Write a protein that binds this ligand. Structure first.
Ligand code: ZN
Lengths: 78, 151, 76, 74, 86, 110, 120, 18, 345, 99, 73, 74, 71
């Protein structure tokens, strides 16, 4: 009766995981990211541009490349 | 030379290692078993299957029940094409692997493929025209073709 | 949807030229050179071509006229 | 692996601090050699150190001790 | 492509024109290494190669050499399907 | 009952020494075992019997929430004094009839 | 071992017109397939692999792509050797070796050869 | 030359008799 | 059993040697699924003998048509049996009666075109009771021969197949006994040597890219036919005299040797010692003697699969009166016609 | 039993027998008559050229179906070539006119 | 710096011997049949780098092994 | 004997690699090509013979361990 | 001569092993074994002489003797 009543009521109603290997950027970028233990992308986004630039052997164009490739893959820092 | 050409017209045909007469150049053209009638007027054919027929009295006159496995085998290239086109397989080998594994989406592709693709049903003695007729396939979870009672 | 072809056969006749014209038009749609002339209803290009024939939008004369005018405008 | 990544990051960080030219002059090789090692070998050395830092398990330790005794016995 | 089929008697000259060589021996296969024999009913020089673009002897095993006839065995290098026509 | 695991048995097309019934017949018998579970939806019962005589449903090790409806249900027969049958029967609640073939949908790590 | 070879020596070949037990229309030659045939899937896979190699080599620097197309006989004649490529690039053989190693490394990248490894 | 190929065959004749 | 027979079923069942019939009367002394032991009555006992009869029942074996031949005891322990009595029931026999089919509650009526020309409508209870289910043992042989490029091997290392696909195979490369296989699974893992593959361009390149090597052996493993799905119930290994046996062949051989000793020792215990020991050495020699195989073939492995075909639309049913029929639909039990007592047909 | 493509016969480049060689269905002579009685000339042509015997045609058809171009390049069936070479292997000169 | 390189090289060679040839070959992608040659070429160089990177390594287990060996003898 | 044959082959190949294919050829009295091809052709077969012949020798890593222990104790 | 000692010892041990065993071990036909041995034993003996087979074991025996002397 309960089953019939239930049917009758129905009637009645009517990315971040990817390693650094997926960056394929300048060897400058890969080397600096490997130095800082930034191996996966999921840890790259939490960084910030002003802090990343502080890395040695990392200047204007390296950060430009990393950020623009991240943007091209629908990613950003934060 | 006579035996090679015809292996007859010389009293006695020459037999082979067994006691059976050798099949001659002329014997491979003439007769019910020669090239003309066994391979040129009729043929074995790809994209073909065969199965027992049941009734399926729910069918409309223009459709027939086709087993899902039979349809999957008969429409394999179409399924590979749809798998590649809809992005579900990168390469044809990958699509073959999916169709072998019968993944859940292969059946959706197979439904899309046969939506309006008729199939010819033929019974063994084709005594007249109506011995071959085209039907729209409806996929059935079984192994017997369902045939409309009126045909 | 499609069950019978009696309006398309009527509009073209001969029951054989209908097949040829429908095949021409269905191949036109199938290759990326043409678009349907009737609202697609999830049909295959063969059925779409038959439904265009029934509507009178496609004939053997219409198809060759369109082919000719496409050739003429290719000059540009 | 994780320990391998930590080792690799530490080695690359210390290479960055010391200076590629300075490390080349210290190691007796050229700058380019250190730079190319940074990509060719350093990961493999890091994995090797990762599997070495585990140490010796007691069972295999006893196995190796018994074998070393056997090879050193008349 | 072709409009009609003509059937007639065959002259010795015509039969020789079809031919790609003279089958001189009754040998077929070498019974140890089953390659075709030199002038037998299965002959690579007369009837063509047994593997695609591979010379029988083994001095030519690339599509690059297509269109040359060997010297250690005299076997043309081409497709194996020609075995159905020669 | 949904699956069984007899001690020295690999498949149902074998025979157990000292047991008069074939393993396939034993499984066909266990298929008709009437039982109800109150608390859980899935329980493994145990049946260990030794010595000549019928092995009936009354010989299944019983917990509080499992009730054997007819204890006289014959499961097998032991025809040898030094004969032992030890099985783990799997009983689970469901609805309708589901053959084992449709139960191998994924093998669920079987 | 010679005994086994002599015993293995092929007996008289079976006639391809040998009737099968039915003896009506089943002959031995009806059960023998053409072993030297390309399956349509294999041919299509070959075409797709050619296309994939083209579309992957496209994403390489000009000289690296040319070097890789030359070192293997990719849509050209017989493969060239490193010395020949230097004869054409007017550079050292080891230079071409390094170039091709780097090109293969770049092609090994993920998101660059996932379809190519799908071809395996 | 019978059915849907009849037209085709006729067309061939159109090209053969020229 | 035939609920309606002609009385000729006992004659057909017994005359065909498909059942075990008592050669001599006595009292059943020991019953088992695989054998019966009879204590002959002294009246039928010869003076120089032990009054014991051992009937060894035929368990699941394959028939010429790939059906299941299996003998089940039809007597209980301690029961009196006379000469000519049936002791085991062979395939399609019930207490010595020929039992070819099942007696089913049939109704004669049209029912919605689901039995239109000769079609048959079947209830789901018929499937549930598995009373038209059949067992279909079948052989599948993997033969490793001596090829010109090198001998074939039955190793478990098979390229281009993952860990899972080789999980059903043991170390020696042969499927386990009792393993439930599916259409496509490997039964015997075999590889044939090959060489001079002649790789094409844009495949040499691909192998270079992925640092992979082209295998020098191609896979020729015995796989289960697509569609077929059963359990492996038997494996036989036939090794040529000169070849060295693998692990599984030796393991099978030891199992057969122990079984042989067990059967001979039990025969002596149930019941002469000179013939027992002499037969044990003959049986032992026969087990390891080595097999005379065809020339060239190195080693044969036969796998016996046991399928279970239940019932489905398309299967042909028939009565004894020439009334054919193909099952068209399998009906829910609540869709079937039923009588006043609620019993469906 | 079903089949799209599989192994092919040796002398005649045609599919094989039934379900043990994974072979195709014989579209015999009476089925050809039934197709002829209909107007189905493309059905018949594809049945006896691209689905059975044309060696180059069937691979092209497989490829064309794979990319959704349901068109065929029929070609000459291989069995007719076998017949021509067999009549020519007698002392009879049979050739195609207007090459 | 070179004496430290030799000391760390000895410690690393000991560690490799204790770990196992199979494991070392797998770790650094060197064919096992050639791993020994690798140790002649890259163990010292790598050692040098560790000496130049002021990395610290210890070799207690070896001494332990000695003790354990004495137990058998 | 199978695993002993594999071990002996590995040890032999390691010894050739350490000494050098060119140097090994120069010392043996053949060409470098001959050593390179013996490594592929016969070294496995000779290794199986040694496994049967029972000529296996101590693995060099355990040899170094034994040397170190004998130095530490003494 | 280390090479000659190795050749002598290897030939003696192979002869002691047995013809059939050696043929099976090196996968050579029993009709070719004498040829194979006469041709290849000197080469492999020279090889092992260069590779210093057994010299490590000799130094290991020396170390074992010394350790026994100390203890
Ligand atoms: Zn040649």
């Amino acid at each position: 009766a309960t089953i019939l009543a239930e049917q009758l009521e129905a009637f009645v109603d009517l990315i971040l995981l990817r390693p650094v290997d997926d960056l394929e950027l300048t060897v400058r970028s890969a080397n600096c990211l490997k130095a800082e233990a930034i191996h996966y992308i999921g840890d790259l986004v939490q960084r910030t541009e002003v802090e990343l630039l502080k890395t040695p052997n990392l200047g204007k164009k390296s950060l430009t490349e990393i950020k623009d490739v991240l943007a091209s893959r629908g990613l950003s820092l934060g | 030379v006579d035996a090679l050409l015809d292996n007859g017209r010389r009293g006695r045909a020459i037999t082979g290692s067994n006691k059976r007469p050798l099949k001659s150049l002329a014997d491979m053209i003439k007769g019910k078993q020669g090239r003309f009638r066994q391979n040129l007027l009729g043929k074995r054919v790809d994209y073909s299957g065969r199965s027992v027929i049941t009734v399926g009295p729910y069918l409309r006159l223009h459709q027939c029940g086709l087993p899902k496995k039979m349809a999957l085998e008969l429409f394999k290239p179409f399924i590979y094409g749809k798998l590649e086109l809809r992005g579900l397989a990168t390469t044809i080998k990958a699509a073959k692997k999916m169709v072998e594994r019968e993944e859940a989406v292969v059946w959706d592709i197979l439904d899309e493929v046969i939506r309006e693709h008729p199939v010819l049903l033929n019974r063994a003695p084709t005594l007249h025209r109506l011995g071959i007729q085209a039907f729209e396939p409806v996929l059935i979870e079984g192994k017997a073709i369902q045939l409309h009672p009126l045909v | 949807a499609r069950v019978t072809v009696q309006d398309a056969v009527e509009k073209i006749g001969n029951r054989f030229d209908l097949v040829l014209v429908a095949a021409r038009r269905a191949r036109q749609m199938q290759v990326g050179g043409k678009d349907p002339l009737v609202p697609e209803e999830n049909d295959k290009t063969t059925v779409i071509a038959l439904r265009e024939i029934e509507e009178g939008l496609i004939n053997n004369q219409i198809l060759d006229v369109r082919e000719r005018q496409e050739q003429q405008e290719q000059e540009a | 692996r994780n320990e391998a990544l930590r080792i690799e990051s530490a080695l690359l960080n210390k290479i960055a601090m010391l200076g590629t030219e300075k490390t080349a002059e210290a190691v007796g090789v050229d700058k380019s050699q250190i730079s190319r090692w940074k990509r060719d070998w350093i990961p493999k050395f890091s994995m090797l150190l990762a599997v070495l830092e585990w140490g010796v398990v007691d069972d295999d330790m006893a196995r190796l001790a018994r074998q070393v005794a056997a090879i050193l016995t008349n | 492509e072709f409009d009609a089929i003509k059937i007639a008697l065959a002259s010795p000259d015509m039969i020789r024109s079809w031919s790609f060589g003279e089958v001189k021996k009754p040998e077929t296969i070498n019974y140890r290494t089953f390659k075709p024999e030199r002038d037998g009913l299965f002959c690579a020089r007369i009837f063509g190669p047994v593997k695609d673009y591979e010379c029988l002897c083994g001095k030519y095993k690339r599509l690059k050499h297509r269109g040359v006839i060997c010297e250690k065995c005299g076997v043309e290098v081409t497709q194996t399907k020609v075995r159905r026509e020669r | 009952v949904t699956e069984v695991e007899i001690d020295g048995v690999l498949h149902e097309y074998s025979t157990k020494e000292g047991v008069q019934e074939d393993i396939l017949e034993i499984l066909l018998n266990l298929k008709g075992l009437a039982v109800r579970v109150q608390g859980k939806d899935e329980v493994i019962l145990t049946l260990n019997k030794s010595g000549i005589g019928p092995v009936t449903a009354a010989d299944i090790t019983h917990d509080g929430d499992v009730e054997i409806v007819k204890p006289q249900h014959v499961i097998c027969h032991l025809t040898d004094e030094n004969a032992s049958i030890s099985m783990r029967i799997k009983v689970q609640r469901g609805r309708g009839y589901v053959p084992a073939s449709t139960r191998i949908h994924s093998e669920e790590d079987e | 071992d010679k005994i086994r070879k002599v015993l293995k020596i092929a007996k008289e070949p079976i006639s391809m017109e040998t009737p099968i037990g039915d003896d009506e229309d089943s002959h031995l030659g009806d059960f023998i397939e053409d072993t030297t045939l390309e399956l349509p899937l294999d041919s299509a896979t070959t075409e797709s692999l050619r296309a994939a190699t083209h579309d992957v080599l496209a994403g390489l620097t000009a000289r690296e792509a040319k070097v890789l197309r030359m070192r293997f006989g990719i849509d050209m004649n017989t493969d060239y050797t490193l010395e020949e490529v230097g004869k054409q690039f007017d550079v050292t053989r080891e230079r071409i070796r390094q170039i091709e190693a780097k090109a293969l490394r770049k092609l090994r990248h993920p998101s660059r050869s996932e379809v190519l490894r799908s071809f395996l | 030359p019978a059915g849907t190929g009849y037209a085709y065959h006729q067309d061939r004749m159109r090209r053969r008799a020229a | 059993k035939p609920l309606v027979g002609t009385g000729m079923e006992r004659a057909v069942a017994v005359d065909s040697g498909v059942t075990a019939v008592a050669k001599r009367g006595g009292v059943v002394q020991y019953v088992d699924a695989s054998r019966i032991v009879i204590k002959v009555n002294e009246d039928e006992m010869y003076p120089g003998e032990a009054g014991i009869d051992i009937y060894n029942l035929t368990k699941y074996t394959r028939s010429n048509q790939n059906t299941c031949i299996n003998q089940m005891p039809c007597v209980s322990l301690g029961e009196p049996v006379e000469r000519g009595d049936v002791l085991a029931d062979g395939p399609s026999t019930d207490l010595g009666e020929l039992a070819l089919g099942q007696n089913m509650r049939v109704a004669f009526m049209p029912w919605n075109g689901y039995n239109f020309e000769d079609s048959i409508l079947v209830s789901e209870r018929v499937v549930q009771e598995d009373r038209f289910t059949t067992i279909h043992i079948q052989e599948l042989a993997c033969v490793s021969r001596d090829t010109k490029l090198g001998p074939e091997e039955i190793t478990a290392d098979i390229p281009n197949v993952g860990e899972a696909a080789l999980s059903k195979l043991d170390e020696s490369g042969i499927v386990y006994i009792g393993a439930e296989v599916t259409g496509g699974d490997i039964l015997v893992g075999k590889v044939t040597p090959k060489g001079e593959t002649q790789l094409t361009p844009e495949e040499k390149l691909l192998r270079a890219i992925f640092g992979e090597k082209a295998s020098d052996v191609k896979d020729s493993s015995l796989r289960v036919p697509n569609g077929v799905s059963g359990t492996v119930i038997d494996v036989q290994v036939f090794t040529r005299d000169g070849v060295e046996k693998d692990k599984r062949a030796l393991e099978i051989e030891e199992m057969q040797l122990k079984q042989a000793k067990k059967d001979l020792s039990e025969e002596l215990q149930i019941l002469l010692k000179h013939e027992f020991e002499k037969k044990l050495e003959a049986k032992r020699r026969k087990i390891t003697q080595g097999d005379d195989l065809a020339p060239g073939v190195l080693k044969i492995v036969k796998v016996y699969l046991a399928v279970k075909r239940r019932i489905q639309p398309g299967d042909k049913m028939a009565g004894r009166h020439g009334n054919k029929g193909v099952i068209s639909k399998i009906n829910p039990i609540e869709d079937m016609p039923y009588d006043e007592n609620g019993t469906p047909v | 039993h079903a089949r799209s493509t599989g192994s092919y016969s040796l002398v005649t480049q045609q599919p094989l027998g039934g379900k043990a060689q994974f072979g195709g269905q014989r579209f015999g002579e009476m089925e050809v008559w039934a197709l002829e009685a209909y107007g189905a000339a493309y059905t018949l042509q594809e049945m006896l050229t691209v689905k059975s015997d044309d060696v180059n045609g069937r691979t092209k058809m497989y490829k064309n179906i794979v990319d959704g171009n349901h068109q065929m390049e029929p070609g000459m069936p291989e069995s007719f070539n076998v017949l021509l070479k067999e009549i020519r292997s007698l002392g009879i000169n049979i050739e195609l006119e207007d090459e």
